[PDB]
């Protein structure tokens, strides 16, 4: 499923729509979505 990261643990999680948004390792309720896999282009100017 979609990947998230615990705000405290930094552990990686995979959560579905019905999953409660918590960190399995520590129970923190704040999660940050993972970086996109599509390449990002930046002009160096």
């Amino acid at each position: 499923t979609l990947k998230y990261i615990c705000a405290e643990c930094s552990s990686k999680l995979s959560l579905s729509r019905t999953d409660a948004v918590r960190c399995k390792d520590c129970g923190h309720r704040i999660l940050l979505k993972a970086r996109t896999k599509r390449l990002v282009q930046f002009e160096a100017r």
Binding site: I5, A7, S10, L32, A34, R35
Partner: protein, 69 residues
Amino acid sequence: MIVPVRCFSCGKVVGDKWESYLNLLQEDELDEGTALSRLGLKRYCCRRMILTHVDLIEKFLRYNPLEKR
């Protein structure tokens, strides 16, 4: 935040002189002017580029990484 790569006014590369500057200030106990002169910064544009820099990245490095691998 972190030392600029080039002097804003003239464009001299000063991003490779930050560590040498700090080493001169700390290890050799030189005052700022002599260290700046030693590094080759003669125009006061470059001298203000290196002299007035505030290295905030150190503070940023104290917080634990958000995405830790």
